[PDB]
């Protein structure tokens, strides 16, 4: 399928144990897609002071359209030293590996895969 319904655990930035997916734009987008497929991906909501506590390159989920079955349609955009790789809508948050952290909420998304 071109799109997959996922429910992403929303993590507090200070709880996150693994603060990024890797060391290159291509690797972080690759790893993010793998963890999303494997159900091992969490979401951190971006506010003041969140991104400097996470590791670059960043992987964002961004709204790709204006929400089947409660699932907002999203796509992946990476960022490294202020340059983004992709073009999409509003940021829903930054993806990180999930290694068993307790979430504060779940974000239902429809991921363009």
UniProtKB/Swiss-Prot annotation:
Effect of residue 37 to R: In strain: Omicron/XBB.1.5, Omicron/EG.5.1
Organism domain of life: Viruses
Ranges where the CoV Nsp1 globular domain occurs: 2-113
Subcellular location: Host cytoplasm
Stretches the record annotates as Disordered: 1-113
Stated role: Inhibits host translation by associating with the open head conformation of the 40S subunit. The C-terminus binds to and obstructs ribosomal mRNA entry tunnel. Thereby inhibits antiviral response triggered by innate immunity or interferons. The nsp1-40S ribosome complex further induces an endonucleolytic cleavage near the 5'UTR of host mRNAs, targeting them for degradation. This inhibits the integrated stress response (ISR) in the infected cell by preventing EIF2S1/eIF2-alpha phosphorylation upstream of stress granule formation and depletes host G3BP1.
Protein name, per record: Host translation inhibitor nsp1
Gene this chain is encoded by: rep
Residues of the full protein shown: 11 to 125 of 7096
